[PDB]
Design a protein around this ligand. Structure first.
Ligand code: OCT
Length: 225
C-alpha cells in the first residue's frame, strides 16, 4: 500500500562557525513523504519540506569577557532564515518477522538555506541513504526508529558581497516515532540531526569559507494516511 505522511517539527537549532555561534528561535518545519511500492519489496520514496527560523549571532564565551576586561562588539539579532529540502529515491523493504519490517533506501536530494542581514545562501545537491525499522506493539500501536546519512556531491556557498564557492560536506539524522492507528495514523517522536560543511579551498584578497557545523534537536509530529 502507498503511504503518505504530512509532518511538522518543533526544534532547537544551533550552529558554530569560526569564533561564533548562531542560535535559532522559532525554528519550524513542515514536510511531506510518499512511500510508493512497486512490488512486494521495491518502491520509491519522495520527500519535500520547508523550514524557517530567526537566528542570533553570538560570540563564544571567554574568561576575559566574564571578567570585564574585554567587550564583544554587537552582532546581528533576529536574522531570518528559510530552508527547503527535496528527496527522490529507491527503497527496498522486507519483513524481519510478522511484527517487524525493515526498510532501506538511497537517492538524490537537494537542500537550500538563505538568510538576510547581506544575503548568504547554501545550496546543496546530495546523495542520501536511509534505514528504518517498523515494529508493531499491538492494538494499532507501533515504534519506528530511523536513521539517514547525507553526502554532498556539489554544495555551494553564496554571498551577495559576489561569492560562490563549493563547500561539500555531510550530515546524519536519527530518531524514533511512536504511532497509533486511528482506524490513518498519528505519530510523534524525537529526532537529532547534524550537518557539517567543510572549510572551502582558498579563493581570491585570499579567503576561505569557514567550516560550519549545525546541530538540531526536535520533536516531529505526523499524520500518516
Ligand atoms: C533512537 C534515536 C532517538 C533520537 C534521540 C535524539 C535525542 C533527542
Amino acid at each position: 500500500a502507498n503511504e503518505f505522511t504530512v509532518h511538522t517539527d518543533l526544534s532547537s537549532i544551533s550552529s558554530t562557525r569560526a569564533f561564533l555561534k548562531e542560535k535559532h528561535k522559532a525554528a519550524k518545519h513542515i514536510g511531506v513523504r510518499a512511500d510508493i511500492p512497486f512490488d512486494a519489496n521495491q518502491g520509491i520514496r519522495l520527500e519535500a519540506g520547508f523550514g524557517r527560523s530567526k537566528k542570533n549571532i553570538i560570540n563564544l564565551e571567554t574568561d576575559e569577557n566574564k571578567l570585564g576586561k574585554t567587550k564583544n562588539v554587537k552582532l546581528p539579532t533576529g536574522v531570518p532564515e528559510n530552508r527547503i529540502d527535496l528527496y527522490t529515491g529507491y527503497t527496498y523493504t522486507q519483513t524481519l518477522s510478522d511484527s517487524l519490517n525493515f526498510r532501506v533506501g538511497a537517492g538524490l536530494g537537494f537542500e537550500s538555506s538563505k538568510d538576510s542581514i547581506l544575503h548568504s545562501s547554501r545550496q546543496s545537491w546530495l546523495a542520501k541513504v536511509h534505514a528504518d525499522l517498523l515494529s508493531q506493539l499491538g492494538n494499532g500501536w507501533y515504534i519506528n526508529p530511523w536513521s539517514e546519512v547525507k553526502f554532498d556531491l556539489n554544495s555551494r556557498y553564496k554571498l551577495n558581497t559576489d561569492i560562490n564557492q563549493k563547500t561539500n560536506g555531510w550530515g546524519f539524522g536519527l530518531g524514533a516515532n511512536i504511532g497509533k492507528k486511528l482506524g490513518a495514523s498519528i505519530e510523534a517522536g524525537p529526532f537529532y540531526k547534524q550537518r557539517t560543511y567543510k572549510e572551502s579551498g582558498e579563493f581570491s584578497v585570499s579567503l576561505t569559507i569557514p567550516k560550519t557545523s549545525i546541530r538540531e534537536y526536535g520533536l516531529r509530529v505526523g499524520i500518516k494516511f
